[PDB]
Nucleic acid binder design. Structure first.
Length: 62
DNA sequence: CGCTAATTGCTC
DNA sequence: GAGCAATTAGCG
């Protein structure tokens, strides 16, 4: 059952994703597209990173 | 094993 | 169509 290769984010991409998460828990479609373009990532990579980041946030705080 | 990226299937 | 919970799975 073919799956996508696991993305290895750069330190730069991870730093900028985390900065985005400290500013906003959720992104609008426009904020997601601006962030994907700025980080040379796909819209779905950013969406999924934000979803998995909220899961971790919930576990560590809840 | 632990961290976390990707997948699935459901709610809303 | 975005979120979320449960899950699968890559890599250090």
């Amino acid at each position: 059952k073919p799956r996508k290769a696991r993305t290895a984010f750069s330190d730069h991409q991870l730093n900028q994703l985390e900065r985005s998460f400290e500013r906003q828990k959720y992104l609008s479609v426009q904020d997601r597209m601006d962030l994907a373009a700025a980080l040379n990532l796909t819209d779905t990579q950013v969406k999924t990173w934000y979803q998995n980041r909220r899961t971790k946030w919930k576990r560590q705080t809840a």
